[PDB]
């Protein structure tokens with residue numbers, strides 16, 4: 211069935227936070243529809259495709275957001291129904307606090323068209339990077355501020371809390387000059403109830419232009435009642451609220467997971483460097499403990515272990531794998547007929563050609579890496595473990 | 602002080618999910634250190650810089666993950682201390698479940714070097730895109746599975762739940778052949794306690810190669826006890842657990858936010874299209890209600906409103922804004938001296954040159970967009986509202 215809809219993001223910071231694949235789909239599309247919030251990103255998009263439409267022109271003062279979203283979605287799906295490869299482009303991650311992307315994709319999918327959303331860099335992704343926090347330690351609760359209030363969503367004082375749309379509390383209408391955030395005090399009351407007047411709240415605004423610095427301003431909950439401080443919270447503001455305390459381990463789980471030395475399970479307040487610098491009353495953690503120093507001393511005698519798999523590929527294979535990631539038309543051709551595609555790629559070795567003919571992950575990997583004899587294959591599979599994971 | 606550390610991500614899907622800015626830093630760096638999980642991405646990186654080191658060679662069987670992380674961080678910071686511009690590259694978002702990035706950046710920052718993490722596309726970002734869910738509706742709780750168990754982290758049956766590292770429950774050591782996930786039953790017990798035996802759990806694995814499809818398999822909690830099903834959960838598996846019910850609105854908040862018609866506040870089970878297709882017993886929602894049809898009918902008579910700001914820029918300005926986003930060396934030069942940089946860009950109009958000299962967001966925007974008279978400036982500022990936001 212002719213026609214496709216691919217929805218992509220621009221990320222938050224102008225131009226640079228777009229993914230390579232998002233760019234390649236924008237370039238390949240027959241028609242591009244976009245909704246972005248800075249003109250440099252807009253201009254950039256217009257250099258990449260000749261047939262773009264700005265969706266922002268469908269907003270209006272007093273016009274219901276839902277009617278705007280229905281219209282934005284319909285403009286995209288109308289072109290899909292004509293048999294065109296259509297790309298929608300939205301700020302950030304195009305499925306994070308975005309209504310028309312989900313609507314348009316769901317319609318396209320239900321009518322039998324190819325439909326896909328590509329992920330992008332969200333404001334929360336930026337927040338993690340700029341506030342130097344890992345959502346994994348100690349978990350992350352993420353809400354829209356009005357939804358948080360209206361449905362009385364639970365906080366955990368032991369985990370990260372992230373609140374979107376803190377500059378738009380309770381606001382229903384659209385307006386081109388933004389909104390008077392007159393119900394912000396309702397949010398502050400809730401934060402006082404949950405955390406206390408002296409608990410920190412970090413006002414976060416990611417840099418939107420490449421040369422700008424992020425806003426990373428720590429206030430007390432009580433400071434948010436001051437008019438001069440409240441005034442700073444706008445339409446691109448997010449709040450990060452750090453944990454008030456650390457949660458203890460559960461003895462039953464320690465025992466069932468066989469973390470057998472129970473005295474040597476760390477104290478709940480013990481930290482792996484670095485500690486969260488936004489949490490109240492967190493002790494300084496030593497970066498170079500004797501164990502760290504001993505690990506560093508081992509670097510002089512280091513050799514890769516026997517099971518390590520060196521890259522052993524070719525220019526031809528690297529080129530084709532790159533083309534498959536960066537050329538949506540090549541990818542579609544490959545997906546339509548693995549064998550015909552694989553047989554038309556010049557300079558591939560027999561193993562490379564065979565691996566591509568199959569399309570199997572393991573086969574492609576074994577073609578591109580020297581899998582050693584030492585690594586006796588349990589595949590007849592890997593694990594990441596690059597964080598403070600398990601125990 | 603000479604030297605810098607920039608940590609960047611590759612995203613999840615091979616090559617294509619790297620951001621433009623991540624690529625530009627990889628190309629500009631004096632030394633690149635990387636930890637990625639597929640060889641196509643590895644090969645790609647090696648074509649972009651002549652001085653790369655694979656951090657994965659510092660893992661070993663039985664060697665503590667913490668010693669590995671200390672070593673990985675130290676390898677990067679050692680080069681920073683020599684005055685080099687160093688880039689670390691990690692799978693996904695480089696601050697999401699990654700220890701050595703945070704460690705290395707914190708050390709570099711405390712010793713007075715330039716230090717920054719650039720966000721990337723995480724597994725959660727992929728999950729939102731592939732499962733067609735918006736974390737904003739009805740909020741999203743995100744945990745590491747072992748941490749979830751050991752610290753008895755709270756679930757909300759009314760919000761999204763995302764669990765990372767479900768294939769590695771309680772696992773401490775590294776091993777090149779992955780892990781036997783023998784304590785998976787401890788996770789399933791907790792999920793049964795919180796949600797019930799018949800509640801859905803979505804096993805999610807994002808495509809890692811461009812031609813692959815994601816795994817999006819719905820099981821009951823009870824089905825996860827079957828050995829053939831449990832076996833499928835591995836090191837790149839994430840669980841998504843949808844809400845069991847919808848949460849009602851709070852009358853006090855409705856009243857304080859002046860959502861004045863109380864009878865016309867939607868029923869808690871009323872949905873904006875599309876509904877979450879993973880939730881149990883969710884009714885079909887009509888995409889084309891009479892209100893949707895009326896909105897679509899208005900498209901024929903549409904003209905952009907008076908307050909809409911058309912792009913009105915130049916090739917010279919678009920080129921420089923693109924260069925600032927995509928050339929870290931140009932950006933540093935610009936940041937060091939706005940005026941000297943701005944005065945050396947040829948073909949800029951006087952307004953464009955002046956806007957760049959200042960560096961102010963508003964000034965750059967007003968140089969690139971026709972700000973109409975109708976939009977009488979409250980700036981002497983915008984809001985997004987592209988989702989089901991406020992009310």
Ligand SMILES: Nc1ncnc2c1ncn2[C@@H]1O[C@H](CSCC[C@H](N)C(=O)O)[C@@H](O)[C@H]1O
Pocket residue numbers: 222301302303304305306307308331332333334373374375376377414415416417418445446447448449985986987988
């Ligand atoms: N520059 C910025 N810094 C911090 N938060 C931002 C931001 N831009 C947008 N946001 C957050 O996102 C909300 C807009 S809703 C759109 C979000 C976008 N799709 C994304 O992926 O993030 C804002 O109210 C704010 O909470």
Ligand SMILES: Nc1ncnc2c1ncn2[C@@H]1O[C@H](CSCC[C@H](N)C(=O)O)[C@@H](O)[C@H]1O
Pocket residue numbers: 594595596597613692693694695696697698699722723724725764765766767768805806807808809836837838839840
């Ligand atoms: N292809 C994939 N699909 C779904 N989840 C994945 C994935 N690859 C990694 N993950 C999740 O991430 C964990 C690895 S920890 C590293 C996460 C990475 N920095 C990121 O940004 O996502 C896994 O246990 C799994 O829960």
Ligand SMILES: [Mg+2]
Pocket residue numbers: 304305306327728729730731733734735
């Ligand atoms: Mg989504």
Ligand SMILES: [Mg+2]
Pocket residue numbers: 366367368369370371451452453454
């Ligand atoms: Mg908190």
Ligand SMILES: [Mg+2]
Pocket residue numbers: 531532534535615616641642810811
């Ligand atoms: Mg590839």
Ligand SMILES: [Mg+2]
Pocket residue numbers: 230231234235534535536537538617
């Ligand atoms: Mg592509």
Ligand SMILES: [Mg+2]
Pocket residue numbers: 337338339340342343344695696697718
């Ligand atoms: Mg981070």
Ligand SMILES: [Mg+2]
Pocket residue numbers: 757758759760761762842843844845
């Ligand atoms: Mg849930």
Ligand SMILES: [Mg+2]
Pocket residue numbers: 224225250251419420922923925926
């Ligand atoms: Mg720019």
Ligand SMILES: [Mg+2]
Pocket residue numbers: 226621622625626925926927928929
């Ligand atoms: Mg750049």
